[PDB]
Design a binder for this molecule. Sequence first.
Ligand SMILES: [Mg+2]
Lengths: 87, 91, 203, 93, 233, 266, 89, 244
Amino acid sequence: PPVYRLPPLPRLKVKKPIIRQEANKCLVLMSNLLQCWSSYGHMSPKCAGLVTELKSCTSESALGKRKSNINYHAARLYDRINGKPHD
Amino acid sequence: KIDQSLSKKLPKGTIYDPFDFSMGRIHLDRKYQDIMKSGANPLEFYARPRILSRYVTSTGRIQHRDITGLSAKNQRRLSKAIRRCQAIGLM
Amino acid sequence: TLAELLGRSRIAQVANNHKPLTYTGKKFHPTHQIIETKPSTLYRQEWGLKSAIPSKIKSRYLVYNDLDTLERITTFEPRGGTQWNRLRFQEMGVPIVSNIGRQNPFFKKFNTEIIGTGGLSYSLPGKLKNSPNGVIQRTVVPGRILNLAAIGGFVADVVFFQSPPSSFNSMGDFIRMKTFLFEILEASMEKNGSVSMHARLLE
Amino acid sequence: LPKSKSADVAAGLHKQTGVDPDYITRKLTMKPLVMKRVSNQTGKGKIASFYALVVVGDKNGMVGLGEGKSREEMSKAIFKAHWDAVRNLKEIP
Amino acid sequence: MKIQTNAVNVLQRTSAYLKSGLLKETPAWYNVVASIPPSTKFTREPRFKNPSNGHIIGKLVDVTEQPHANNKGLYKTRPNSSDKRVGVKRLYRPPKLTYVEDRLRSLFYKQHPWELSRPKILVENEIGDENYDWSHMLQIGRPLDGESVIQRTMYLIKTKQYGDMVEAYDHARYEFYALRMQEETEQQVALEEAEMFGSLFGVSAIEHGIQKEQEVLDVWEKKVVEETELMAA
Amino acid sequence: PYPNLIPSANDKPYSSQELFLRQLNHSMRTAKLGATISKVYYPHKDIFYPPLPENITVESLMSAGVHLGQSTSLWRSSTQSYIYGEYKGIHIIDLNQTLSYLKRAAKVVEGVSESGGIILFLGTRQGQKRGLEEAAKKTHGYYVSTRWIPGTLTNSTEISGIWEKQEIDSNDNPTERALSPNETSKQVKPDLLVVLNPTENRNALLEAIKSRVPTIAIIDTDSEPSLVTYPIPGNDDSLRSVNFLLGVLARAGQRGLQNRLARNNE
Amino acid sequence: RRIVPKLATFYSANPNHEDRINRLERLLRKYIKLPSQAPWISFDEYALIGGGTKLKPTQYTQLLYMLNKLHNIDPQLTNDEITSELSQY
Amino acid sequence: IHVVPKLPNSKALLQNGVPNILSSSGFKTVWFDYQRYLCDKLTLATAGQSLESYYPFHILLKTAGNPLQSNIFNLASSIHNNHLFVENILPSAKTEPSRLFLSKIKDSFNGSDWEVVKEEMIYRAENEVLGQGWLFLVENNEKKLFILTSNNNGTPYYFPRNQSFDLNSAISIDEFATLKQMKELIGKSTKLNGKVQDWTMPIICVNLWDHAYLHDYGVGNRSKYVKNVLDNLNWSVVNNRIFS
Ligand SMILES: [Mg+2]
């Protein structure tokens, strides 16, 4: 296969350490409720428990719950892992 | 009951390992995954759309050497053959 | 000369290969030479290779491809599972015989194909195995059903008198949890080097 | 309890690098070659710095160049240059 | 990296200092370094033999040294293109060491995959101390393996009992097989004896394996349930 | 021995401590019994019983793993003369050459120890510490395992300013008199820097050549051999080969120390 | 006579601490087989005898580990030398 | 590589054997040849393994729990047991049995005499082991001693490999119950290797293999041989391997 060797870089590091955390539960519930209220008119009792669940979630604060360290291993091992020729 | 994606079916004649039952094995398997590669100039296949259509996207575009995974010369020959094909009626 | 000593020596003895350490395809036999240390030598990170091996490795066995690479790391994997499969097979004590009518290859330009078995079993088929309870006719081995059954480091074809619903249908795709007993009938070995066992489910 | 500059230099060298102070004081004789005032444009402003470059040498084929620098007045820079020169003594053929 | 003058010319630099009077007292190392001089001759030295094979590096086969006709029946009457190019880099680049035994090793493990599963200690004991007569395979300090076979093959080749290499290899293989069978029988019978005389083994190999699998399966199950729940939501 | 051992009553069984002692006693007397095991490598034995420079062979060096150079792709061509050939995608160090350089290095180590010089063993790699300390103990010498702070010799007064200096006889007796504050502040430079990983501490080498100190180093097939006064071609990556070379050097220095002590006594 | 450094670790980063650790390490090695079955000096307290400003948290944690293990040696099997070495801390 | 240890006054032993119990030839058969053979076998078994570095006793302790590699255990057991037996035999390196040892015996065997204990041991040897084996007088974590027979290469140290009675022949109910109890205890251990704790130490090993007696005493008279061994053994050695 085609290998791709980089040039000498200043610092191997992920550009942005997106953590990729899970979406909020309260937001999901709110979206579900919105979807339900699309159908079934304005406020029918099919979404009677969903609204209650949303209220329970968003009682203390609007959202329920409130970093990736990959730099350390890349930073550490860049100089080793290089195919940089000798001094 | 459970879906197919979260259970590695060990083949009949194969060896296995304790690790092989795990989630991590399945993830590893998921991570790690022809006549033109066989060694015959693709410019024989310009009257054979069926075979040339394998090296083409659903719309009709030719696939890149990164995708198709050919020798550069062999890729260019394939491309030529495809272009010849579409110049003709067939393909 | 030095050259002669090098040719003799234990690194030259390990036959070189650049096969993948991670091979997700079908594994019918060992790919790489397993290499053990002693505990003492492990304690001071010495495996008899070019370099020291990381102190993170606490297992005594490993597999490798390159003594040293361009990345300044030996290409290895700390695992020697293949020895344990062989030892399990030996314990099971089901002698491999060629189902095709042929002479045993160990008795009597180059052929790269596998000479009989690959050396997982040098056992001969004619023996019985006595015990306090008596002469063992049926070899009892615990294994796991997948859907085929995993029986002591080998996957094996299975047969039974009646398909038991109580054990199977209660947990349809969690059959791997419950270990069942098996009666291994015989072990044949095909051209590709796969051990084709045949078991029978006991209840 | 408790020329002078040259003696102090020699003493400091003897501490740092085990060199004979008496030799440094007597046999070595120094000579400034260049004596710039030099500056850096800092956010604070233009920050001047006195740059010296001072050959020292026993007049028997033993010679050393040395450069030194001080934001404070040039005497300190010259001292540093002298120090550097004695650290870098060199037998010319 | 440039060849450093200042790492090996230490005593000269200090001798100058001592002469001057910069140094009052001589170092401890000074006399010792004078007695035992450094190399200071950092050359690229050429090599004329491959040590492993014993091939000659430097020489060139001439037109006069090849009188008879070539493959495809043409007489060499001129130097070719490669015979004119100045092959100096071959004299200096270090030789690729080749052994006949390496090929035999490769063949053996192709023929016997499960010999790879037999663990190999690479940490050498005294290489000088050993003294193996390859009249037979079973040496004392050495275990039974493909290596021993190969050594036996080489011995046979040397002695010309089997003039052909392949035949010698086969013979060595056949010697190995019998020994392996004997080893296999020894262990089984020892196990039988142990069973007979009331020995008790707490964990058998297969039982151990099953236990090992069980923990992994338990780990998988909890994870798999969570994944199914996630998929549902 | 064992003054705080509370022995169990005669009617009662053995205590845990008493049982342990019994086991120890058994181990000392009758455990190593059935056989004796000749011709086998114990790692510890290279540190505590290294061979003299004379008695070292090419075979012993090969067993140690000294012959295994860095790699074919990590080649400093400066080191070309030292290498024997390539094999298994690895340059292999000519071991007769290694031997001769080791002997030369061993002799200079012995000489400075005899003269009463300060030998300094520098070894920044992971496993090297214990063997390095042993070597430093063997000759009345010094070592560094935790990293070399740049400028220990060049900038000695700042770095090594607040540590205790000592006085010493022609023998190695402290002769504990008070060092004057002027007498204390002077630099105490090594008379032999001996490194186990010159490629990892370039700085220390540079300092040594600036500070005018002869130096010994295990030059692998990627290391610059000109950067040191006495290079020993060999395998610096494996822990046991380094220990073997280091242990030999320590033994050579030990001998020279013993000779110095003998001549002092005379 | 010769003027010479006291500690064999002299040239290392924190020489005094290293020396202190070495004695404990030696003791552990000596009594490594002795079977195993709190009020240790503070970081600041240790610094005054040990490294001072050059004392690091990791070094202190290591020292604590060394002491604790030694202390854990079953009181009946313990030595006088070990207790003397631990007395300091 | 495992090699036989150099015995004290070796040349004298070669010339004579042992004054009372073993001839020049009979001693050679038991030690100078058989022990050597055993060592060679052990070396062959454990040439390239991690076991090469370890002593026979330590090998046996490592191996005991493993069902496969029983051959190694057997060999290691034999080597250690045989050298213990030789150590017991040896004339020097007259000594009487210790006072402490006698007191321990008295405590153990209901206040019986040493001659009585010997007689009980020889009776056990006669009755228990058929074919080959070993006859130990051992001491456990409870300070009292007891007699322990093993059927070929059974170690006195580790009770699951005592190899104390033959299930090839028929067995008692009590013996079966004892076996079952042992098995249960083993299962209770709960480790990955599955190996119990045990502190049994041998005080007087005797070699009931035919390599000792058969040359001198013939196929019968094994009991007589055992008695002779008991009469004339190194007591200083025994005393040394007794106290905690
Ligand atoms: Mg290196």
